[PDB]
């Protein structure tokens, strides 16, 4: 147990890894999953929320009491709301008015202010409004898809944690779903330096396969599929791409909750499905690692766990 800390943000990181036992068999490589939902705010985005705020503070771009703005309907909004409450900043989020009352409660519980944009305009409307508010009011905009502090934090924290966790082993493949691409890029850089023969694999939705050269399209893999190539994604880091369908990912998440006791979001199901595909190709005795970005409890009102 960690010694007492003065601020909840000091427990971000240091997340555990579990070996899968039942959804993959002994004829395939071993598959390990890093539980990023064990971060105190509930997802991998705790890491980047903290890093972007702390970098802007260290650079004098913001100081406690300042207001930040970000367009987000996902875990980055929760992460920034959480970190802003913990560090004494004011958070404003733009998002389409389709957001549920429970999610509004969650962000407002941390004291965030919401600016709702037209539902039919989806993310484009929220992004435009955030830029307008930044220019009108001077709010700081973290810019999760361009801010180098995002992949950098994974290079400094997530990746070196994996090196410590896998001392005495070599990792043969690391796979991660791409939202901003910061996890894949920062972890991938660290792991490729330590294990130069590793394969790095990007995961994206089959229904929106932009990294594969396809066009954006509607998809249900929460956390993935931004519809463009983020600046925070190093497109040279990955050796291959695995596309995952909406139904395949949901079926995997359900199996993993029931058969491993690991209750994770649909993007975690996509990651595990892809890791199992890779494990079958590499065979017994090899080591495959992936990241589970968020917990299934955050998605009980989606089809994911509706039986």
């Amino acid at each position: 147990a960690q010694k007492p800390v003065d601020n909840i943000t000091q427990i971000i990181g240091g997340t555990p890894v579990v070996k899968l036992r039942n959804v993959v068999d002994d004829n395939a490589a071993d598959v390990y999953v890093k539980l990023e939902y064990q971060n105190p705010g509930g997802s991998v985005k705790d890491r980047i929320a903290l890093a972007m705020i702390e970098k802007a503070e260290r650079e004098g771009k913001i100081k406690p009491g300042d207001t930040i703005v970000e367009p987000t309907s996902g875990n980055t909004g929760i992460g920034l709301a959480f970190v802003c409450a913990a560090k004494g900043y004011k958070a404003v989020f733009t998002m389409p008015e389709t957001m549920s009352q429970e999610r509004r409660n969650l962000l407002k519980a941390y004291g965030a202010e919401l600016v709702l944009t037209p539902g039919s305009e989806a993310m484009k409307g929220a992004i435009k409004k955030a830029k307008e508010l930044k220019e009108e009011h001077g709010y700081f905009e973290p810019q999760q898809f361009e801010n180098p502090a995002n992949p950098e934090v994974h290079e400094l924290t997530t990746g070196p944690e994996l090196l410590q966790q896998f001392e005495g082993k070599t990792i043969d493949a690391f796979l991660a779903g791409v939202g901003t691409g910061g996890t894949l890029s920062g972890v991938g850089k660290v792991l490729k330096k330590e294990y130069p023969n590793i394969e790095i694999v990007a995961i994206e939705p089959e229904a929106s396969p932009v990294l594969s050269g396809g066009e954006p399209g509607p998809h249900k893999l929460q956390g993935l599929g931004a519809g463009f190539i983020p600046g925070t994604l190093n497109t040279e880091i990955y050796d291959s791409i695995i596309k995952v369908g909406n139904d395949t990912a949901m079926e995997m998440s359900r199996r993993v909750a029931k058969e491993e006791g690991i209750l994770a979001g649909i993007s975690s199901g996509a990651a595990i499905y892809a890791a199992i595909q890779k494990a079958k190709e590499l065979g017994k005795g090899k080591t495959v690692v992936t990241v589970l970005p968020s917990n299934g409890e955050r998605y009980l009102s989606t089809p994911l766990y509706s039986f």
Binding site: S73, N75, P96, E121, A122, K124, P218, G225, G227
Partner: peptide, 6 residues
């Protein structure tokens, strides 16, 4: 109209 949750 494109939506993502990031």
């Amino acid at each position: 109209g494109y939506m993502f949750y990031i």
